Amino acid sequence: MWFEVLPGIAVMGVCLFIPGMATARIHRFSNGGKEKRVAHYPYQWYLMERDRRVSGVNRSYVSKGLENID
Amino acid sequence: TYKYVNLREPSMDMKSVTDRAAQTLLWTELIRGLGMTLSYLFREPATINYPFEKGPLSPRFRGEHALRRYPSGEERCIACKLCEAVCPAQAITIEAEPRADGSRRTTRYDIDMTKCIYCGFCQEACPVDAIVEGPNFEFSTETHEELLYNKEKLLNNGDKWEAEIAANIQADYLYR
Amino acid sequence: MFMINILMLIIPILLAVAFLTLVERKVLGYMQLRKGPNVVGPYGLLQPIADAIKLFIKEPLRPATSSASMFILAPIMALGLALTMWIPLPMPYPLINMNLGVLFMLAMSSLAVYSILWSGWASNSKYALIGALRAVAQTISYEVTLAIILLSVLLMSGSFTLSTLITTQEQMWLILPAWPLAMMWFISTLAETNRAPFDLTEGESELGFNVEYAAGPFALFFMAEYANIIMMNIFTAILFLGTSHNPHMPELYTINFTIKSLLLTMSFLWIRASYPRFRYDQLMHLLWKNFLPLTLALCMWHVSLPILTSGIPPQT
């Protein structure tokens, strides 16, 4: 019957699902549980590089807040 | 009597002209075609599960040739060569001689299954129902020689399929 | 971790292409009142694997090519570019977040024409070269409308960033304000990928350029061709059927986005089973005399519409 086509579509659906899921999960793993920072314009990159210097460790995704101010 | 297939005049009123303009720009008749293929997607396919299911046949089916016997085991063929004379492809070669007990029997009965056209004229011309076309249609070989049948092969086919050949003849001899 | 991401994209793309062949043979089968592959594995699930193994252990013809350097370059270019058009796709997060991602996909798609033209030379047959030329004319002609249609849609988006199309469609699908462009974008994707009713290469009794290839190299062109069908239909969903993106549940986007791309991919099989084939001059007159006049007019209407409605999108 027609529903015997679903097994092929489900496999194709799972295959098309891994690239989206994998990329989203790797970004959060590589960026401390946050989304990867987007720098399309120089201003965004300037802030991101500044975060690298302000974080201590040379990581832009390690954010420092009020506890870092005297 | 006759009828015209393509002799219509398209109405040129504004509504009809706009109906054709919508058909041209909105692809109405093309989507109507997608509807028909969509419906077939949800019908039950007509495919059967061969070899576990087989296509329907009838008692008259003209399959593999075979030689039959009487209920006593005596061969029906008495070497009359009517099948040989009628065979349009000249696929039958027969030789005969008086048997040891004096009966009229064949010492050769070959059907070249690669000259045969499976016409059935042999089973029609036989006066003793000796040569028949049985119901088997699955006997493809791996070599050309295996399709040159002799008397031993044809008799074996009769002994093999006599259970089904007799029932087919019983169900059709009244139409003959 | 980035290298793992690349392979997490490349392998599923090929696997999806492997099982799009099974889906196409079964969706075509049921639309034709039959089943399609259901013997090789449960419901034909192992059919793509059998075909793949069989092709790669069959002797390749490899005739006396004119060059033998364009004979290897062509399949490499075809499959290299097909995989390269996925790296900017947001699903919802791109592998590579390009600012001009939309323009990058147009550029790579235009380079794919060289695969047809290089394999036509390597064929060494004059007739095989004529078929390649007709395929190039069809491909370049129908990417004129892709560029202008894409430009018209971006005037409602505001940039060439692919991930901005997600924001642009956060209240409504772009299929609504731009369904006329959607109709002409969908058909241009069919013509770009040489899909029916625009498949003259496979349109026996008239013409394929990739005919001297067989077994393995043939499978490389086939994988590239079927990888672009998925990619084009993924692009269509992003461009006209945007999916809402919740940053805390990114898998919801992927599930919804995946379903839309499958339905559009199956529409390609739906169309192939329903219509006859265009003549070569008829699909040229479809582009030059029907699509192009409308695409130019709609482009003017879409440059001016945001201005007169005070609805110009943000530059960033």
Added chain:
Amino acid sequence: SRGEYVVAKLDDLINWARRSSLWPMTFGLACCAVEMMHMAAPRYDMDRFGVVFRASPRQSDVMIVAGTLTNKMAPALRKVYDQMPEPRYVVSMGSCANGGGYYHYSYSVVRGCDRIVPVDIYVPGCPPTAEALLYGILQLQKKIKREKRLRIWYRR
């Protein structure tokens, strides 16, 4: 694991791949092509066994000689057999291809396509039913299943 065991398994894998993906090129010459088209029709649907409906001569794995082969046509049949990548099998469908058939004694007929090309399976009938042809194809799969190329290579 012994070498005779690895080679035995590799034979099954390649044998399974080849018999599960038999793409035929059909020489539809005469009436037997109509029965060949009925094997592709919904009733039997050759495509569900992995047998694609129509395949180009440079992608095909088996040639089905379906119809009378005349002298005028014999050179072009050999020309297509020689251009078919290996492994390549040939199936003779019907009496005309088998041994000449109704036209065995004609001045213009090749008395069997097996004097022009090697043949692997003979399907008898005039025409063989769509089911009798499907039996031949399934019989070719079993023939391919018995091949022992790798095992024979390992014993050279």
Added chain:
Amino acid sequence: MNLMLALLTNFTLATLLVIIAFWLPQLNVYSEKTSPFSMKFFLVAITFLLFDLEIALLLPLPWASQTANLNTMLTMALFLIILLAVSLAYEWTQKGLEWTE
């Protein structure tokens, strides 16, 4: 760097598949087998090139709408598209978009 890795990976994989596609079957040892310019096609390619050059001038339209000179910008945007339409109209009426000899 990420982009360079992606490009290198895609084409490296494409190359490896091609080489092992021309030689994997050669693991098997099969028996040795032995043994007009058309002016209309050229016109299509040239027309595409010229139409493709006028697209190049239209691509920056999304950025052009951000100016404070919308009256000037909209006037020239419609000028380029209209002349692109006049180019099509000329070939159309001169039998340039035809395939019958």
Added chain:
Amino acid sequence: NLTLNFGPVLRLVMELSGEMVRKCDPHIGLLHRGTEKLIEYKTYLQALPYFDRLDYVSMMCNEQAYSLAVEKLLNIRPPPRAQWIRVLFGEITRLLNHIMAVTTHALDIGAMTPFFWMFEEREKMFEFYERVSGARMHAAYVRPGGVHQDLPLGLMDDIYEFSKNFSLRIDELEEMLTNNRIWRNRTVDIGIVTAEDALNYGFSGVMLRGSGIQWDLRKTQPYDVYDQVEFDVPIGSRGDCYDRYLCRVEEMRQSIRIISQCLNKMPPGEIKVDDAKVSPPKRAEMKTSMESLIHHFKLYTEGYQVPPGATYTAIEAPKGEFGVYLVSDGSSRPYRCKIKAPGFAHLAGLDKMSKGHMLADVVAIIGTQDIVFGEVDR
């Protein structure tokens, strides 16, 4: 001009001035088998199967043409029930041909799906063939003097059930083709044939009626019981491939109309001429009567003698006028048997119909002529 020896059972030697076609030279004989010469060595009964294999999509129509020719020379008349079966299976066979003609024509130009739908209907008409004769295609059922066997009990019910649902099958074919613009672009104004040229070039069948010529041998020179059934003859107005396509679709509809009447008006009685010097006796009486056994023996060894004479007998076969010029010398074996295939004259006109069209149109023109090379080559 570029020359293309396309080659293979059709070889076209064409010279092209770009996209256009300037000269088309069909090369035939790739399926020439000497059918006409072999028949001279066969008795009149042995030669009958040769006519199933000429136009192998319209088997029983070919058998009927040869049966009428021999009966005319024999000066006998098949019984009325045999003539209703021959008309009944004459029109079932027209459906088999037109399904093949319309759907392979559509298959060649890209439309692949209607082929499968209508071949499930062909697979059910092949069961009617196999139930009356035991063969799906080559029945050898229609013979001089009538038919071979009476219809099996329960057959006409199944034909009624089949004919009841078939009009919907055609309607689905037309939902895919008739109004489809892509299909109208491939056929409208393609292969236009003027009425005067069609007559001079020896055309027949839909090739004439598609150009407005009102001619159909079933109505002008009726045979069997075709003057006792009401049906209409489709007539085109433009002479293009689209008009011929519509004609073939409408004939499939008028065939269901004739079939509906053959079932209702099927009479009783014997099914082969009650003249044992032409038709073989019943088997039961062959095994009890001396005269019946002698005639069975002679009819199957020597055959019947046909009085001397020559006739040209033609019928409205699905592909056009199919006829035989049959010469009898007075013996049991025909002296000469020329077969007039409708597709032989149609193909000879491919060079004219294709003048001024593109290469892809030659595929559409060949489909519209409905060419099967079994009858062209013979």
Added chain:
Amino acid sequence: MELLQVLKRGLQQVSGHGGLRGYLRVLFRANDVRVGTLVGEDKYGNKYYEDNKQFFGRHRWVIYTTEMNGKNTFWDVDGSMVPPEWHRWLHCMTDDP
């Protein structure tokens, strides 16, 4: 409603074949998991089923034996293994098994 009864028919196919193991056996041998009415078994082990709610052609089928004449036919089933007595019934040449 009918939606829920469809999923129940699928489940009872597993029970109608004798558990999961039997269900998978007929899925990998016969590529079909319908449940029919056992009409009989021949001397070689072939089992013949029927179901008259299926359309003509699919209302009679044979599940071939796993061993015939000393040959292992678990995977290598052949259409010629049906004996003549069951050949006539399985091909709808008669109504009587």
